[PDB]
Design a protein around this ligand. Sequence first.
Ligand SMILES: [Ca+2]
Length: 312
Amino acid sequence: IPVIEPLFTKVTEDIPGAQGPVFDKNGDFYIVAPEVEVNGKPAGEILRIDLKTGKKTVICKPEVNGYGGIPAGCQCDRDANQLFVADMRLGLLVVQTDGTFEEIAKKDSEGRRMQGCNDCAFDYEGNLWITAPAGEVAPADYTRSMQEKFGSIYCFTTDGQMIQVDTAFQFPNGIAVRHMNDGRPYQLIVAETPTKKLWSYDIKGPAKIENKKVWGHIPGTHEGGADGMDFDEDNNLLVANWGSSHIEVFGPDGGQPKMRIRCPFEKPSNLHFKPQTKTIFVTEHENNAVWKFEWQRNGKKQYCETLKFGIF
Ligand SMILES: [Ca+2]
């Protein structure tokens, strides 16, 4: 497997468990620091990063009834410039640029207690596919599916339903939606960290997935595996392989990586493209920092970049 070593430029530092890189509708950059703690208790943060200076600003430090959050992944909304943030303790949150937030659901569509989420992905129809590797949300005792298969997958629909679409995953982590050239969502990819697998499903409709399949294989025998992921404009899937010092590049058909990207660190956690560029911002856990490098092409257009009221 051919490996490339592009120049990684430092963006910002000192962000405990740095991940969830995302750009909003104005091109502003945000990341999450899930591991910030106050007296050993969760006090995770959502930060805005000034790309010109690298200076950090904590816009949200989510807490519900005294239970601090562990913000873990993000997606920017389209119809309003707001962030949907997966939280390992609080489930799914909607965070405004002013720093205020709202908890989306304490229970799913079946009345079952919500699970802590790690990452999410919007399809072009506006449906949000979410990974939930943690156990029940706060106030329940914090647990995570690294060893046992209790991690779930959800789909927060346009009509506001929080639907659990699958279960029994050993730490479902990164998640991405593959679309047809005409924009129709047709395949859901889910990373299962410790098992070194990438799973796929055929998206038949909103909150409807079928035919679970082992889509791709993650290299290495190290502790870790596939973390965050994202598609480029040609539908190649770039996946952070936590603990391998590489970002794996899968072709549109999956299987084994067709290319690897060497990182100047061992623990890449997530990655996200800057709109309209080849620039990929990579968060990592070794130094708790954010970096950026140039990919071979532009990123796949995000849902937030599309137009609701366009002609085409
Ligand atoms: Ca991303």
